Design a binder for this molecule. Structure first.
Ligand SMILES: [Zn+2]
Length: 404
């Protein structure tokens, strides 16, 4: 397939122009860190010395912007952890990469410690704890660093997350008040608030990160109890019968008090960020971390249901499109050696040319929603050695069974 090369070239031209002349451009979500990851994964390819030059260009461009403006966030998708993830594989190549990563890490530790200190549980909102902007996503990156100086930070985050699974409002903690929803659509969708049940912004994501922390060597009775409780909550509120393997995006106070779903959702979708595909990671990781065969076997059934169904899928993007579903299947196959998703993976790769050509320009070039995320997926099918840690950003943990 010669069409990856053409597309990459145009992406490079877009970013060469942009750097020759805003906040978004330093983010994993939409900016240079996602671009650096896509190009870095193309190292086997013929133009890889040109690609490494661009990477270094974009890196120097990044430090220059950091030196002038600073960062306001340590977050995986908008802050220092996403920038650090994007260059982590270069750590031992040159002193300049290691120097940059050390700065990022110290800022991250400062950032997290400062966040936990000024935390007010009454104002708890998803970016506090979540994958995209919060501590779960930051921990995903942190757990790739083997330096024991970060042990204290890791444990501080782990304890802080676990404690959010405790009952508060009499009963509550992770519950989000209507006022503290991330946008007004959600404020109006949830006028009495909700417990967010998505991977990206909710309970599954905390669960995954706690399971991953345990296999990495970082857990205590309380974090394991947080993980168990999270899975128990998924098991309790799972939809039934014709809606087996489905979950609403959010659970409201009364439903939680009743311990059943009361009001049906208007819109559930099959996505990484919300719904079955992302939720299947919780069961997979929980099942492997807790040595529960039932959870692992359920994880497969949940994902398989979503692959069959593809509820709400209208694009090939990572976040809530088909490339994200595919990459999750590829992770299942890698860890379990399951053949269940082989046909979907094969069909996606057969359709690869049409996927890139019809890929919207409206989604931009970035990782999370843009074309470069799709290229990353397609590229690791063609050459499965990962030169980078890009998968960490999606909580796809290739090392989950490598131990600690
Ligand atoms: Zn999404």
């Amino acid at each position: 397939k010669k069409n990856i090369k053409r597309n990459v070239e145009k992406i490079i031209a877009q970013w060469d122009e942009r750097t020759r002349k805003d906040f978004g451009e330093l983010t994993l979500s939409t900016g240079l860190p996602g671009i650096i990851l896509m190009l870095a994964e193309l190292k086997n390819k013929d133009n890889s010395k040109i690609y490494q030059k661009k990477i270094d260009n974009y890196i120097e461009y990044i430090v220059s912007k950091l030196s002038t403006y600073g960062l306001l966030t340590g977050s995986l998708y908008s802050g220092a952890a996403g920038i650090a993830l994007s260059i982590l594989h270069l750590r031992e190549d040159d002193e300049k990469y290691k120097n940059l990563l050390d700065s990022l890490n110290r800022y991250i530790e400062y950032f997290v410690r400062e966040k936990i200190e000024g935390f007010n549980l009454e104002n708890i909102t998803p970016p506090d704890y979540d994958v995209i902007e919060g501590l779960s996503g930051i921990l995903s990156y942190l757990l790739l660093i083997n330096d024991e100086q970060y042990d204290d930070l890791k444990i501080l985050i782990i304890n802080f997350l676990s404690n959010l699974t405790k009952e508060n409002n009499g009963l509550i903690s992770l519950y989000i008040k209507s006022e503290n929803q991330m946008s007004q659509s959600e404020s109006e969708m949830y006028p009495l608030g909700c417990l967010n049940m998505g991977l990206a912004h909710g309970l599954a994501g905390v669960g995954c990160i706690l399971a991953y922390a345990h296999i990495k060597g970082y857990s205590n009775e309380a974090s394991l109890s947080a993980l168990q409780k999270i899975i128990f909550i998924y098991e309790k509120f799972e939809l039934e019968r014709k809606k087996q393997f489905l979950w609403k995006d959010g659970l409201v106070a009364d439903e939680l008090k009743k311990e059943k779903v009361i009001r049906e959702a208007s819109f559930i979708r099959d996505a990484w960020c919300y719904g079955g595909p992302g939720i299947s990671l919780l069961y997979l990781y929980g099942g492997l971390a807790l040595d529960n065969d039932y959870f692992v076997d359920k994880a497969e059934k949940i994902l398989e249901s979503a692959m069959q169904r593809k509820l709400g899928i209208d694009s090939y993007m990572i976040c809530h499109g088909y490339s994200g579903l595919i990459e999750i299947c590829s992770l299942f196959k890698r860890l379990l050696n399951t053949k269940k998703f082989d046909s979907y993976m094969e069909e996606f790769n057969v359709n690869s040319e049409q996927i890139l050509e019809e890929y919207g320009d409206e989604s931009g070039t970035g990782f999370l929603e843009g074309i470069s995320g799709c290229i990353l997926v397609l590229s690791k099918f063609e050459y499965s050695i990962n030169f980078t840690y890009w998968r960490q950003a999606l909580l796809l943990f290739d090392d989950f069974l490598k131990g600690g």
